Symmetry: D2
Subunit: 359 residues, 4 copies
């Protein structure tokens, strides 16, 4: 049966999560996106936005609009291949969404204004049954990372959960292979050369929550603390309090890369780690962790759906020779694409794990 | 006696205006900046923004902070070499600004949200006498452009004037020399290759009133309609209805260039015009109109304070040989820097004219 | 009847011309690439450059490499979809290439160092029949433009042609409609906001041939002269010495746009001109001239094979109202994609005519 | 008797060395630039390159040109603030240089073509006394990093030395304070988020010795194996085989930052370290090592002339709380400016030393 989904806040990620569904072919098939919900309800504008993307190209499916009722000014309904997505009027209080009336049970919370466990739980009153925050949450919300711990998901306990962050979903799969393969992680420090995002600015402007982040983004290397490496602990309890790291926001519109440096728990070799990474990318991490041994550069990872793309050649070429513990692993990720697909995955995995618990 | 000034909206232009004041040694002499206003009153953060500038480099003059009164939580007063400046809390409604209790009579309206004669008049009700809008205004506000029509200022008839746009300010100087030297302007279409600004988005974001204006700002040549060229009709009435243009927002944090095409009212030559422009920049347009004959690029115009820098070589080298009517005039400008010096130039003018009206 | 082609200068445009063939399913079938050529003969590196592209995405046809004789040090054969290409050794003189023995009659000269009639003719002495200069030629080389004058090709007269400049291929299609649709062009100046190219520098460098051209490309707006507006006269004589213009190289890796300002021979409106362009694009200029009525930006025209894409909105919205002679036309173009496609088009047309020319 | 220096290879770096040299106010007084040597002799084009800079702003001193002898075709003399500098015609062999005749004892190697000890020795036979290669050198040439080991300069032993690279001059000061202050370095991996350089390309082009380095510079994050780290084992032998790292070339014209990670040789805290670096910057590292505790971004380091600017905030905030061995240190540097000044520093040092050993 179709999954009645409702996307909250049809922004950059909102549109990427939706386009994820389509790409994978889950529209009007496995997932029923009953309604999206951003600032306005100008379906014609929503069409244009989905249709054209500066970095990800032109949407592969044709988009069109229509009215939900002949008594409407501008088209208020989006049409993607027979399926009809409604654009409802945004809200300030999730508890005031027509989710119940619309028939939505799973909402993807991607506004960015409801990452608080209880704030997102407002969608439940609205009539939804499960919510997935497309970012790190707070309030004891369960954090799940596909291919790492999504199986810990519990249908009767977890109703508001987080898919975590783009960087966490990129780092986690590497730390996970390391620990599961027995290499271990004593202590680790990571840096992420990250492409600027919507939170940043075009020219120097006011940003009281992050002074460096208000500076002209496309012409600066902006440092920033991140809780991504420390969030790995939530997903891999064994590495709790053992990792941390920063981020250097740099002048590229999309795609980033993880720079991990850690000390293995036991003696090994970089060749050994390299081989363990590739082996899992083809097995238990397939579709989540991938790798490459080609001389690629950020642009080559655009539209890659893996959560983490290990860079074999950058890794094998920049470590200490004969070193048995102090290592560096490099991995790429399209911050927008990969994560967006993981959002659909987590949601799907939940619906299936929710079905079973019932019928 | 110095004139009490207050700057509403301390950003790109609010700050460059201040830096221009310090630079020309006017602070504490011709002008007494009583206070600035933005999001909060954290002087310490205001210092940081003033101290470091991504495009204009380190603020050459020292800046520290203190408290207006011990009963204040964090510092709220900026101190630039003895000159103290108060950081007031932003106001949703201009009429709610404590001007009359501060002593401020002139307020440079640069927040960007009160360009409507009616909405900007709120500064008068707050307790101020005059208000200069750092952008094209509406509502009847008299529009003045230094070196072109700024003498049409009526001390008693104008209380909320518009210093025009940055572009109008680069164009006017030229169209004035043409009209004044008798070259005349039959018809003209301008195109400004404008570097992006704060109203643009780092990544494809929401922008309902200007769709293309929402697409990624540092990786796209974004077209846009502009009033700048038309506005030249308000400063030089004989051109009203003869010009109009557009803007292409390209990937540069500062400095723009006007590409003016037009047909003269009489038979002339690009040489005659070239020589007319340089001659003018050395005479009646000195300070306002500048010009170069060197192989310059945008960065070379960074921090140039003129309103228009005629590019001799670009013009002469790219026109039709022997033509006597159809010409192209290229002229650069630091959309941030010069225009800011003009805002100060304008206020100063208004001050003298207001001092000589009742005296 | 696989046409015989030999690409000399397998670089930015050389590779694009190749990916141009494949895209149209002409490889092996209509056209047969015997052997390409650049500095080295490393097929692994060639294959790599082909597989991944920063602006145009990933190559859609698997590429592998083999040998032609085990006596070779590294793979020197480029197998693209079953069809195999040979990587010949670069020469300082076009006449030194084994075109004769290689059995290569047509040779797409895209090195950019032999835009001279005689120079490129070195290809004919090496054993080749026809030589197309994927760039503006000089020395009495017939310049053709698909959809504007390409039929002027004399199979038995023109053995060396010039497919003109990427800019002329965008302007001409536009001017061609104006002249033919009876609008006429009295005088015109054209400016092109062009994105940087391989001839520029990453950081300030030496460029004695073009001082401005030797300045940090990705952070400046470099002015530049151009002969594309003047070259139209060689393709549309009616305009001889009636058009010219410049270039403005901005910070973008690909896609450029024309901004033609001109006066019509007779009276009209922007509507009539807009209507003619949309008409011509759907009829006698289809495939060459296209148009858009959407809020598009630079990146949206990435991979557009048309030569000129007229921007309806940007044109109707930025001209003088009720005006009858002075006009501005805004037209886009993927300076890399479209052009490359025209190169193949001219090559296939020359074959079609060469064939029947004696058969 | 001011030192007679001659610059070999007046390129991006030859200038920076001369501009830095002028900045310190040494031209004519302490040092005396006799003549510079570059491919071309065009002095008007040299004065241009010296007059304006895309990143470092405009040269503060006046630059004009003349002729050394009335019997000279074009200008061959570059006159900087009164001081006279001759522009000798370049060469491919360091021997064919008239250093001795020119009376040049100290020549600065920035051509980037003679980084070899044996090769660069030509100057010596060219009558030139000593040679400072402004880049990593081979052939077992002595490396010297100002503030780290420049005191290992033996006049009668070293006549052709290397000033190491820009990155090493950033890492060395940091590692030197760590080793000399008791912390020690057991193992360490560095990463430099580096801005693109001249060796990179605007758009995807041919780069056989570095494939990723051939990709478009201002639109990608290009990884790269680096030596700087390992080259530290030459300046601080004790770390021989203990360090290494890579590089991420990001979209910025200038300014880079070093992100070093390592395990101390004893127990400490990120505070002890932080204090030790600040103490050193104020004492024995003054001028070479500097630090900041403000919220800085790359643009804020433009024109800083220290070799390493430690980022106190970025460091203290991104290390594991209570950690004792595994640490991250973030340090900035104007990869162009700092190094340039160091080159002058090494030369000034050598001089004084040579004066006392000879006198
Ligand atoms: N790199 C990425 O794009 C990325 C990757 C992973 C996770 N995330 C997280 O996902 C969230 C969204 O990120 P994004 O890149 O899409 O940002 P965005 O700013 O591009 O998208 C957020 C959208 O929310 C809409 N919005 C705001 N308030 C709303 C409201 N009350 N109701 C409805 N819509 C509202 C806005 O119009 C905006 O388009 C953030 O929490 C971010 O940290 C982002
Ligand atoms: N930067 C340019 O090129 C430029 C040139 C000429 C004219 N202008 C005009 O100047 C004005 C400001 O432009 P800018 O570049 O400085 O933009 P900006 O965004 O950098 O400056 C606006 C500032 O006002 C503050 N602000 C917002 N609402 C406020 C309120 N209610 N009260 C007080 N402060 C408030 C913001 O925090 C911000 O710092 C606009 O009207 C713009 O059109 C800009
Ligand atoms: N890319 C565009 O926008 C564009 C569009 C139309 C026409 N053109 C014209 O096409 C020509 C090439 O442009 P491009 O963008 O491909 O430049 P490019 O520099 O990227 O490609 C030229 C390639 O030729 C190779 N080369 C140099 N000398 C050679 C020789 N003797 N033999 C074989 N290979 C050699 C180089 O390795 C280089 O990669 C220029 O003349 C340019 O004016 C460029
Ligand atoms: N500023 C930096 O980023 C930096 C820092 C450290 C080391 N380096 C190294 O220093 C060297 C120069 O650096 P750069 O920034 O000037 O590079 P660049 O490529 O910008 O400048 C090199 C210049 O050398 C000139 N040249 C080449 N061969 C010559 C010859 N035989 N005679 C005279 N002139 C000649 C060229 O005109 C060219 O412009 C390179 O080897 C570089 O790797 C650069
Ligand atoms: O990448 C992120 C943090 P990092 O750069 O420190 O790894 C992620 O939170 C993006 O958030 P946005 O709110 O969409 O900017």
């Amino acid at each position: 049966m179709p999954i009645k989904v409702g996307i909250n806040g049809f922004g950059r990620i909102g549109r990427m999560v939706f386009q994820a569904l389509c790409e994978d072919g889950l529209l009007g098939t496995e997932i029923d996106v009953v309604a999206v919900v951003d600032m306005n309800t100008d379906a014609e504008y929503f069409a244009y936005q989905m249709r054209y993307d500066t970095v990800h190209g032109k949407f592969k499916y044709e988009v069109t609009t229509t009215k939900s009722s002949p008594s409407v000014a501008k088209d208020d309904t989006l049409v993607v291949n027979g399926h009809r997505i409604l654009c409802v009027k945004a809200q300030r209080n999730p508890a005031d969404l027509p989710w119940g009336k619309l028939g939505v049970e799973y909402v993807i919370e991607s506004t960015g204004l409801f990452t608080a466990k209880a704030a997102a739980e407002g969608h439940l009153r609205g009539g939804a049954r499960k919510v997935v925050i497309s970012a790190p949450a707070s309030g004891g919300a369960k954090t799940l990372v596909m291919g790492v711990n999504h199986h810990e998901y519990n249908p009767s306990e977890h109703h508001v959960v987080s898919n975590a962050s783009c960087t966490t979903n990129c780092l986690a799969p590497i730390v996970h292979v390391l620990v599961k393969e027995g290499f271990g992680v004593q202590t680790g420090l990571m840096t992420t050369i990250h492409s600027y995002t919507a939170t940043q600015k075009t020219v120097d402007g006011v940003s009281v929550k992050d002074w460096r982040g208000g500076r002209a983004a496309a012409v600066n290397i902006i440092p920033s603390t991140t809780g991504a490496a420390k969030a790995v602990g939530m997903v891999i309890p064994s590495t709790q309090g053992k990792l941390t790291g920063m981020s250097f926001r740099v002048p590229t519109p999309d795609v980033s890369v993880v720079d991990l440096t850690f000390t293995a728990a036991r003696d090994t070799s970089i060749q050994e780690i390299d081989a363990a990474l590739k082996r899992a990318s083809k097995t238990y991490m397939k579709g989540i962790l991938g790798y490459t041994d080609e001389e690629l550069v950020s642009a080559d990872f655009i539209n890659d759906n893996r959560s983490s793309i290990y860079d074999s050649k950058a890794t094998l070429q920049n470590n200490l020779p004969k070193e048995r513990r102090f290592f560096k692993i490099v991995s790429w990720y399209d911050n927008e694409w990969g994560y967006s697909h993981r959002v659909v995955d987590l949601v799907r995995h939940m619906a299936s794990k929710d079905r079973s618990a019932r019928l």
